[PDB]
Amino acid sequence: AEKXX
Amino acid sequence: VCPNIIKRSAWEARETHCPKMNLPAKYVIIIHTAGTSCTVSTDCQTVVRNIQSFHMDTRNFCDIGYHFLVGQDGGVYEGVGWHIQGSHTYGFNDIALGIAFIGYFVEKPPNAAALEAAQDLIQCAVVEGYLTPNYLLMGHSDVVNILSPGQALYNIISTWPHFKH
């Protein structure tokens, strides 16, 4: 997994 | 029609109040958990439960980052569901439904039951209006620098309709 961005 | 779908209550998900996902999503991003796999439903729930707590407790996400997960048991597990923001891909958490195959698939691909369940799921999303008809399908690695969903799995989805080449 990568939240926000 | 739509595959069964095992809900959060079934795998005893912790309670949260996270931001809503605005439907319909424009993309579908394929991911693998890169962890252990599971071929029986009770084993998969435990795996999902631990992921939620890993994401929440160590990655500090609001909840499990996936919208749904798929097991080698041919089961579709509810992550945060269709209505909640995701925490799976930078810049696409509000516009992309993140679907993770439970397991590690660089050398070996998910079994037929898993691959099949994943597709029935995608089909359902369109039919139900959760996904735009012209949606784009992409591999986690096409979007961001990350080791997902794994080459073996990548080769399979790249032959899928809507896969963005």
Curated annotation (Swiss-Prot), chain B:
Binding site for peptidoglycan: 55, 59, 66
Domain N-acetylmuramoyl-L-alanine amidase: 24-149
Subcellular location: Secreted
Domain of life: Eukaryota
Residues covered by region (Interaction with murein): 88-93
Induction of expression: Up-regulated by exposure to Gram-positive and Gram-negative bacteria.
Disulfide bonds: 2-124, 18-62, 38-44
Tissue-wise expression: Detected in skin epidermis, eccrine sweat glands and ducts, ciliary body epithelial cells of the eye, in small intestine, colon, stomach and in mature epithelial cells of the tongue (at protein level). Highly expressed in skin and esophagus, expressed also in tonsils and thymus and to a much lesser extent in the stomach, descending colon, rectum and brain.
PTM notes: N-glycosylated.
Entry similarity comment: Belongs to the N-acetylmuramoyl-L-alanine amidase 2 family.
Quaternary organization: Monomer. Homodimer; disulfide-linked. Heterodimer with PGLYRP4; disulfide-linked.
Protein's job: Pattern receptor that binds to murein peptidoglycans (PGN) of Gram-positive bacteria. Has bactericidal activity towards Gram-positive bacteria. May kill Gram-positive bacteria by interfering with peptidoglycan biosynthesis. Also binds to Gram-negative bacteria, and has bacteriostatic activity towards Gram-negative bacteria. Plays a role in innate immunity.
Protein name: Peptidoglycan recognition protein 3
Species in which this protein is naturally found: Homo sapiens
The gene coding this protein: PGLYRP3
Residue numbers of the full-length protein present here: 177 to 341 of 341
